[PDB]
Coordinates of C-alpha atoms in Angstrom, one line a residue:
Chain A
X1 CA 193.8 58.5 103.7
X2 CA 196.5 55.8 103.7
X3 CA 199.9 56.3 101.2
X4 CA 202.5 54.5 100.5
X5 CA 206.1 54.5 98.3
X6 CA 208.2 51.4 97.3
X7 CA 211.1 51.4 95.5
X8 CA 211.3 47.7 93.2
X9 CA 214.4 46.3 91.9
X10 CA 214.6 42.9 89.7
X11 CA 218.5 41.4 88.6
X12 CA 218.2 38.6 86.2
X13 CA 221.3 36.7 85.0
X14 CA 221.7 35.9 81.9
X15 CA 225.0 34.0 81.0
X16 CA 227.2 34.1 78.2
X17 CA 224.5 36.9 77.2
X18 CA 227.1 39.6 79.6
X19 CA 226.0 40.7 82.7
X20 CA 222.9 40.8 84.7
X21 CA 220.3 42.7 83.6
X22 CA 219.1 45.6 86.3
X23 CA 215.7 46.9 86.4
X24 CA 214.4 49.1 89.0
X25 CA 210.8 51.6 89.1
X26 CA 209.4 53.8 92.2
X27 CA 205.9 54.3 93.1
X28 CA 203.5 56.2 95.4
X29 CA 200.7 54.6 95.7
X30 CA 199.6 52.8 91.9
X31 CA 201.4 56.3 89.9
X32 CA 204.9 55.2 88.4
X33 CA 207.2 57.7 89.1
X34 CA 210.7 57.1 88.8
X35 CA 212.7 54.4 86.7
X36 CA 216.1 52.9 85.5
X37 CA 216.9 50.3 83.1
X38 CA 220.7 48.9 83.3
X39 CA 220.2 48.4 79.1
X40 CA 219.3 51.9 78.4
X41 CA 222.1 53.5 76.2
X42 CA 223.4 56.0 78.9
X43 CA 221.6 54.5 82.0
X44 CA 220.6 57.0 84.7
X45 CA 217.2 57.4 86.6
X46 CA 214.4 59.1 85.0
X47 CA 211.5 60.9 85.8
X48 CA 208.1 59.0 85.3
X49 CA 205.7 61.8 86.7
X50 CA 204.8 65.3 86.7
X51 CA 205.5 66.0 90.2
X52 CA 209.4 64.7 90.8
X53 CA 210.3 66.5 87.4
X54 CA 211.1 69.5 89.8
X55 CA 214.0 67.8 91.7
X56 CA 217.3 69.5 91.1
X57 CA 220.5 67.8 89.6
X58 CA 222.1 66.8 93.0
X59 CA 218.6 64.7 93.4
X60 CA 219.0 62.9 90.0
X61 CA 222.9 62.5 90.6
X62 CA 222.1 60.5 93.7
X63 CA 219.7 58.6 92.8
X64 CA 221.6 57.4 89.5
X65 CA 224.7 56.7 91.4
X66 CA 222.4 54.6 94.2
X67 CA 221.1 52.7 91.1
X68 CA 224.3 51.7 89.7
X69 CA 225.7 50.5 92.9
X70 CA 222.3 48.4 93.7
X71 CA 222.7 47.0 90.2
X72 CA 226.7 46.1 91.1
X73 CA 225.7 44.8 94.6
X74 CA 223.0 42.8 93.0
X75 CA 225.6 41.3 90.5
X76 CA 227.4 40.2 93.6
X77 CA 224.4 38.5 95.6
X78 CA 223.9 36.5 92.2
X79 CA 226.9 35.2 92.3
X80 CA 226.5 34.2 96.3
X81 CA 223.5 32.8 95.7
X82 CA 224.7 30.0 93.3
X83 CA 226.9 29.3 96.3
X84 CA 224.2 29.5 98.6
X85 CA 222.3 27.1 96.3
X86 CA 225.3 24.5 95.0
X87 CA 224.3 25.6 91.5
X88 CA 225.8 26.1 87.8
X89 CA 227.2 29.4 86.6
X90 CA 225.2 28.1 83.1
X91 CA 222.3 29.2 84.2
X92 CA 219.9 32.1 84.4
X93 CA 218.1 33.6 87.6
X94 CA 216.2 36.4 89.3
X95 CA 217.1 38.5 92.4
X96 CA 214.1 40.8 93.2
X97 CA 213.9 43.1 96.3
X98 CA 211.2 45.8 97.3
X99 CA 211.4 48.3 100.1
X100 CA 209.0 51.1 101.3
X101 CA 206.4 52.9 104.1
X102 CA 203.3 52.9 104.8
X103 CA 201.9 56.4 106.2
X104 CA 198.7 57.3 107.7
X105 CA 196.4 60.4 107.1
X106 CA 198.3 61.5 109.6
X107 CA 201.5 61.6 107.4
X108 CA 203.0 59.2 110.3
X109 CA 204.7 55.8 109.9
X110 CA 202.2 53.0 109.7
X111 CA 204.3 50.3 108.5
X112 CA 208.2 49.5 106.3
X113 CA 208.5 47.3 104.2
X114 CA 212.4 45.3 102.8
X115 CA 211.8 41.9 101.5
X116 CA 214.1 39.7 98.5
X117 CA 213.2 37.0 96.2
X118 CA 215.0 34.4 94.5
X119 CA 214.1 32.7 91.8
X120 CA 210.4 34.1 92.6
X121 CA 210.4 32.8 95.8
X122 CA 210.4 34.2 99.8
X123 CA 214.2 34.7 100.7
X124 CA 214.3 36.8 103.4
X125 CA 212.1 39.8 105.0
X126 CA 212.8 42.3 107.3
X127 CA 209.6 42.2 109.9
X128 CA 206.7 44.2 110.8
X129 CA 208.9 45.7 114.2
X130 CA 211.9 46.6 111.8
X131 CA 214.6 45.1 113.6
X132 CA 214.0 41.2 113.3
X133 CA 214.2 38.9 110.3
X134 CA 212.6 36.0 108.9
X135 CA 214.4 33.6 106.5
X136 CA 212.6 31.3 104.6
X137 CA 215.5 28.4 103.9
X138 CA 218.5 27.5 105.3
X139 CA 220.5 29.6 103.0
X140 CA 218.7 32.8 103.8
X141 CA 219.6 32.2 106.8
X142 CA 223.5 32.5 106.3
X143 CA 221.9 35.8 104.9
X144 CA 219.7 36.5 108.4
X145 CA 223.3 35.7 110.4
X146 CA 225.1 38.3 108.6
X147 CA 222.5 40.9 108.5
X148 CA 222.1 40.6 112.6
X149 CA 226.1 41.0 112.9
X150 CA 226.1 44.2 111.0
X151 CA 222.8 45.1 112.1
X152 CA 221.1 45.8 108.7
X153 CA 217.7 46.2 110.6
X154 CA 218.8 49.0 112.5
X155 CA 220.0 51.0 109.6
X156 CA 217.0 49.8 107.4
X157 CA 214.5 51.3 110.3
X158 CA 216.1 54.2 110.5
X159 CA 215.9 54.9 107.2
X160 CA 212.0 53.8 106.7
X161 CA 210.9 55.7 110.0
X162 CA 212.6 58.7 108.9
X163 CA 213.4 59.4 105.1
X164 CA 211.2 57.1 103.8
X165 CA 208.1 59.2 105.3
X166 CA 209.7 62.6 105.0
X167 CA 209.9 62.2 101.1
X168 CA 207.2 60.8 100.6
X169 CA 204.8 63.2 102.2
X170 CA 206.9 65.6 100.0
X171 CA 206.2 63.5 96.6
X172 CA 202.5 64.0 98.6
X173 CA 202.5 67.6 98.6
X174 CA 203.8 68.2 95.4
X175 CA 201.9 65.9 92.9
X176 CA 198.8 66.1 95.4
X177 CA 196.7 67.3 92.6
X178 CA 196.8 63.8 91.1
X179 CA 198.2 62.1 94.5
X180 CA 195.5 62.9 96.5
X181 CA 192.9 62.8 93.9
X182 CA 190.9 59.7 93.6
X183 CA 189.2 59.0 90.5
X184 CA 186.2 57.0 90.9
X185 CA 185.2 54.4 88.6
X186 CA 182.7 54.8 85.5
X187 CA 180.3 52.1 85.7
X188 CA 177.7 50.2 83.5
X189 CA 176.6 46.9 82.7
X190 CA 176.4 44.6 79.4
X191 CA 174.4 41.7 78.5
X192 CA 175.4 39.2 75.8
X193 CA 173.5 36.2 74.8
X194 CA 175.0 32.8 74.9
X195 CA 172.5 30.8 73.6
X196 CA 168.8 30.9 73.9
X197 CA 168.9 29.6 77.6
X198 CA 171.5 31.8 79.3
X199 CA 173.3 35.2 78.7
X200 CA 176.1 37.1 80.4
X201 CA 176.2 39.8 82.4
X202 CA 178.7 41.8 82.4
X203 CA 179.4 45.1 84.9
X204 CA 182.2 47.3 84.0
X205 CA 184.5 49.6 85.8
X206 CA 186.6 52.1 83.7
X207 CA 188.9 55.4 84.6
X208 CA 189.7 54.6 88.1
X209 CA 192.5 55.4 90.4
X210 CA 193.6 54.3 92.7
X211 CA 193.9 50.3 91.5
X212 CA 192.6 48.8 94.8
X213 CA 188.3 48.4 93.8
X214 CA 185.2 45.7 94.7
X215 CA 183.4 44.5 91.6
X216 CA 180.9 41.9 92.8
X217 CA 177.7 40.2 91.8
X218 CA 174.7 39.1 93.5
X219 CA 171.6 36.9 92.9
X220 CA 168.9 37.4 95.4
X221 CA 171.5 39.1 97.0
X222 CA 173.5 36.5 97.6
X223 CA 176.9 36.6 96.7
X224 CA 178.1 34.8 93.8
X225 CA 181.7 34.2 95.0
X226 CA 182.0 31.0 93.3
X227 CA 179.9 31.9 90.2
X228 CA 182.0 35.2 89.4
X229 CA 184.7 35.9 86.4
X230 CA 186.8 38.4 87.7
X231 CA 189.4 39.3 85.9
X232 CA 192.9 41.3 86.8
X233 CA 192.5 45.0 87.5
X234 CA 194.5 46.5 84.3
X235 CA 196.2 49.7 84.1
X236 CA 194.5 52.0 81.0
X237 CA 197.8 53.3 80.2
X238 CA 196.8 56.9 81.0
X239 CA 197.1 56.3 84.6
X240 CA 193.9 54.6 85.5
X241 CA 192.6 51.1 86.3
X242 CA 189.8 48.9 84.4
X243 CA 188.2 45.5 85.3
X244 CA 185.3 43.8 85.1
X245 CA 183.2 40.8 86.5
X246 CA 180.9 38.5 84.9
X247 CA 178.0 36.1 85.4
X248 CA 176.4 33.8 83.0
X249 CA 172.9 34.0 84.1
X250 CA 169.7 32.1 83.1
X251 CA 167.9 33.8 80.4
X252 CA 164.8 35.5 82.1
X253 CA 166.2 35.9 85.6
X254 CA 168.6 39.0 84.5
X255 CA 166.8 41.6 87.1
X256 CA 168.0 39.4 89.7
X257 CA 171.3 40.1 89.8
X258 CA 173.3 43.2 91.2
X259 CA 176.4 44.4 90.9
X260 CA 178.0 46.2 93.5
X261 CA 181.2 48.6 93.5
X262 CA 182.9 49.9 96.1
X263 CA 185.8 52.6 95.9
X264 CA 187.7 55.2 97.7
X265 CA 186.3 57.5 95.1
X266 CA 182.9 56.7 95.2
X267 CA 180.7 58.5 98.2
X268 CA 179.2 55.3 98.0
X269 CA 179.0 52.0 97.4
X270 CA 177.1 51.5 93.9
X271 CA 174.7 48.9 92.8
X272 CA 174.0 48.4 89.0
X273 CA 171.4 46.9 87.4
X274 CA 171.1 45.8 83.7
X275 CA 168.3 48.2 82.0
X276 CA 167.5 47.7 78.8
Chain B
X1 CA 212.1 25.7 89.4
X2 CA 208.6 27.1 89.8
X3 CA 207.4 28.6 86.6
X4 CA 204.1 30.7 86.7
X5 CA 202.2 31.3 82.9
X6 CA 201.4 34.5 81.9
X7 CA 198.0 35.8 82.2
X8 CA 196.7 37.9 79.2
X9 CA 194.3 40.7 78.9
X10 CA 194.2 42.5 75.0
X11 CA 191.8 45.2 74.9
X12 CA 191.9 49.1 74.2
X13 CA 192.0 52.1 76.3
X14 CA 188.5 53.9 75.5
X15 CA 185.7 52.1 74.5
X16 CA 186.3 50.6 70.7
X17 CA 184.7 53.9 68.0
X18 CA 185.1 52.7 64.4
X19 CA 187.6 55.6 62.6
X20 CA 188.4 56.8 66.0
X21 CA 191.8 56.6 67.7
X22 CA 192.3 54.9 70.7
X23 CA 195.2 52.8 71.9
X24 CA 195.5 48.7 72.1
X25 CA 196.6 47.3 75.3
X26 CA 197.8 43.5 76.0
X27 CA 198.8 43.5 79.7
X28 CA 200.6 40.4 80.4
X29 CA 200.7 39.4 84.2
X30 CA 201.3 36.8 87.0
X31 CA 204.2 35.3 85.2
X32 CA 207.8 34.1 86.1
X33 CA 210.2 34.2 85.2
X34 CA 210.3 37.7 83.4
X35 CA 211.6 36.6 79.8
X36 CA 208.5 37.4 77.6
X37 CA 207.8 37.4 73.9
X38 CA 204.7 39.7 73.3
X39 CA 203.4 41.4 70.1
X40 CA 200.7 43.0 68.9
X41 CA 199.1 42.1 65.6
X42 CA 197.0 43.4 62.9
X43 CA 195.7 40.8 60.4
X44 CA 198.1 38.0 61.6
X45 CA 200.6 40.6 61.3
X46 CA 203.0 42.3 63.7
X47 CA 202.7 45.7 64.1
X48 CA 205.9 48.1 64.3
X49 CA 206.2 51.2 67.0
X50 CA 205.1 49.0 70.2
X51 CA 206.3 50.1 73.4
X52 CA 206.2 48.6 76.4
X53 CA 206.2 49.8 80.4
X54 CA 209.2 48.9 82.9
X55 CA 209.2 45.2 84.3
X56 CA 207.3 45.5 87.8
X57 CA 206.1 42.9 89.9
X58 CA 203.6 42.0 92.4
X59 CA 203.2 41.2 96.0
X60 CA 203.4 37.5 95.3
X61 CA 206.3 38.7 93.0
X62 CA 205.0 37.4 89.6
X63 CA 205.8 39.9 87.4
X64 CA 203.5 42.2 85.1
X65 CA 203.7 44.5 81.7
X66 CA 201.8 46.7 79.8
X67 CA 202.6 46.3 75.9
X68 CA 200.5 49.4 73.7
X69 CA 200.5 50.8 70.7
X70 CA 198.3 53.7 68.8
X71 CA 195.5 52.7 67.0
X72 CA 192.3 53.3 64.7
X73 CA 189.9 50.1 65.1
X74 CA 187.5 49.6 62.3
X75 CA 185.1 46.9 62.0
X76 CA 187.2 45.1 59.5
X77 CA 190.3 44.8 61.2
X78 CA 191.3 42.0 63.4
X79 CA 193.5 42.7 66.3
X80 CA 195.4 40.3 68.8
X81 CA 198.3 39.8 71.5
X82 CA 200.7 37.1 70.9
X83 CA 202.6 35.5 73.6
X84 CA 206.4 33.6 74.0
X85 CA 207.1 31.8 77.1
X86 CA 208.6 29.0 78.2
X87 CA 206.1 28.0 80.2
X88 CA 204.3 27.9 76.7
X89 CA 205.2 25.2 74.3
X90 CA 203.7 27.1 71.9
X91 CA 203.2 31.3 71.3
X92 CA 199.9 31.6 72.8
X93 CA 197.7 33.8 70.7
X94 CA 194.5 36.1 72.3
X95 CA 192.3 37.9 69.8
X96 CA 190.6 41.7 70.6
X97 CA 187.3 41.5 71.4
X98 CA 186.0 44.9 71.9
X99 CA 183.6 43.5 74.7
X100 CA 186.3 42.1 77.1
Chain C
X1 CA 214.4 58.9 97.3
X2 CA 215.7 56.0 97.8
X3 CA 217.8 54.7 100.5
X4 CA 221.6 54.8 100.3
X5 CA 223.2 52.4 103.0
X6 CA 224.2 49.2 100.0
X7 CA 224.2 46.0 101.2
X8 CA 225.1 42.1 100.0
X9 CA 223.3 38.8 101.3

C-alpha cells in the first residue's frame, strides 16, 4: 500500500549548559532507521536498521556532514528566534522541524511534507501544493517573506517530488522483507473483577506492525466511544506495537460486549469475545 | 509557555513468565518540553544498565521515549517507572502491573 | 537520504 519517510530534527537550547543540543532520527513508515545525537562522543549518523547498513562510506559521509550543518543552522535560527520573539538569552527552548513523502502503491508521490515548531507550537509549513506557505504568527511570517524571496518552496518540491521518492522506494526494495511485511496483531481478551457488581474487560493487541490499528468495544453493538479506555499504541521495543482498550462492564452482561480490530495485517476485521 | 505532562505506560515486552526473561518497558509520551527524568526501579530502587531510544516526536509535536531494561520478573519483585518533569511538582511514580 | 539545500528562518 501507502509508504512514507520523514527525516525529524529537535534543537533545544540550553544556556550556560554550552550549546544547543541536536537530535535528529529517520523513518519509513513506524521502523527507525537512521539517527544522530549532537552529544555522542564522535557524532556522526548511524545506522538504525538492517536494510541501510549496506550504504557505502560516501552515503554515511553525506549524511553526517548534512547533520552537522542542520545542527549549526539550527543554532542560528535559535538565536533569530529570540529576536523574532523579544526574549532573554537566559532561557531554554525547542526548534523542531520534520520533512518527508508520502508514496502510493504506485511508488508515486502522494504528498511532501516540511513543517517547524517553536517552543512546541505551529511556526510555519510548507503546503499541501509545495510551493505556498502558511505562518502561524506574525514572526513566522518575517520567516514566510524570506523563504518566498529565495524561493525555499521551489527547491523544497524539487527535492520531495524527486529524491525523496527515489530513495525511499530504494529503502523499500531493500528492507522489503520487513518493510513490506505487515505483522498483524495477536489478539485476546481479559476479564478482572472490580467488585462484585462490575468487572473489566479488557481486549489486547500484541506484535503488530505497522503502529496505525482500531481497538474498539461494543455493547449491543453499539459503540462505546465514550465508555472506552484506550490507551497509547506503545512500541514493544523489538519493532512492534501493543495497546489495549478497556470497559468496565456490569457483572453478568460480559457476553454483550465485542471487541473489534482492524489492521492492515489482518484479512479481516476481528471480533473478540470473552470465553471463559 | 505551553507545558504538556508526560503520559506513562510501564509494562514488559512478552507477557510477564515468573524465572523467564523478558524486558521492562516505561514509554513516556505526549510531553513538552523534552527534559525528562525517568528510571526504572526494582524494590524502590533504581536499576543500573537502562537505555533509552532517540527523542522523537509526534504529529502534534509532543515528544515520546522508550526507556528498557533486561529483566527476570518473579512474583516477589516489585517493579515501577519513575518520572521528573517540570510540569510535575513531584517525581511521579507508576508501578508494573503485569495486566496493563 | 536526506535533503541537502540548508536553510535559516
Amino acid at each position: 500500500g501507502s509508504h512514507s519517510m520523514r527525516y525529524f530534527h529537535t534543537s533545544v537550547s540550553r544556556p550556560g549548559r554550552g550549546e544547543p543540543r541536536f537530535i535528529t532520527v529517520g523513518y519509513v513508515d513506524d521502523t527507525l532507521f537512521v539517527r544522530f545525537d549532537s552529544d555522542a562522543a564522535s557524532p556522526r549518523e548511524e545506522p538504525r536498521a538492517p536494510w541501510i547498513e549496506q550504504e557505502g562510506p560516501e552515503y554515511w559521509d553525506r549524511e553526517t556532514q548534512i547533520c552537522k550543518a542542520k545542527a549549526q543552522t539550527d543554532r542560528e535560527d535559535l538565536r533569530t528566534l529570540l529576536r523574532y520573539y523579544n526574549q532573554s538569552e537566559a532561557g531554554s527552548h525547542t526548534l523542531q522541524n520534520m520533512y518527508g513523502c508520502d508514496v502510493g502503491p504506485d511508488g508515486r508521490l502522494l504528498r511532501g511534507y516540511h513543517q517547524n515548531a517553536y517552543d512546541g507550537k505551529d511556526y510555519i509549513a510548507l503546503n499541501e501544493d509545495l510551493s505556498s506557505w502558511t505562518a502561524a504568527d506574525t514572526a513566522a511570517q518575517i520567516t514566510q517573506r524570506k523563504w518566498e524571496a529565495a524561493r525555499v518552496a521551489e527547491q523544497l518540491r524539487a527535492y520531495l517530488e524527486g529524491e525523496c521518492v527515489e530513495w525511499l522506494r530504494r529503502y523499500l526494495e531493500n528492507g522489503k522483507e520487513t518493510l513490506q511485511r505487515a505483522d498483524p496483531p495477536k489478539t485476546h481478551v481479559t476479564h478482572h473483577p472490580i467488585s462484585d457488581h462490575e468487572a473489566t474487560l479488557r481486549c489486547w493487541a500484541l506484535g503488530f506492525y505497522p503502529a496505525e490499528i482500531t481497538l474498539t468495544w461494543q455493547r449491543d453493538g453499539e459503540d462505546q466511544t465514550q465508555d472506552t479506555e484506550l490507551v497509547e499504541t506503545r512500541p514493544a521495543g523489538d519493532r512492534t506495537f501493543q495497546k489495549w482498550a478497556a470497559v468496565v462492564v456490569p457483572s453478568g452482561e460480559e457476553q454483550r460486549y465485542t471487541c473489534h480490530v482492524q489492521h492492515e495485517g489482518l484479512p479481516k476485521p476481528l471480533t473478540l469475545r470473552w470465553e471463559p | 509557555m505551553i507545558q504538556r505532562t508526560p503520559k506513562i505506560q510501564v509494562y514488559s515486552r512478552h507477557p510477564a513468565e515468573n524465572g523467564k526473561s523478558n524486558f521492562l518497558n516505561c514509554y513516556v509520551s505526549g510531553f513538552h518540553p523534552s527534559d525528562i527524568e525517568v528510571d526504572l526501579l526494582k524494590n524502590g530502587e533504581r536499576i543500573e544498565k537502562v537505555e533509552h531510544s532517540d527523542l522523537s516526536f509526534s504529529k502534534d509535536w509532543s515528544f515520546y521515549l522508550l526507556y528498557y531494561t533486561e529483566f527476570t520478573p518473579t512474583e516477589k519483585d516489585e517493579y515501577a517507572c519513575r518520572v521528573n518533569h517540570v510540569t510535575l511538582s513531584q517525581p511521579k511514580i507508576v508501578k508494573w502491573d503485569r495486566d496493563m | 537520504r536526506r535533503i541537502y539545500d540548508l536553510i535559516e528562518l
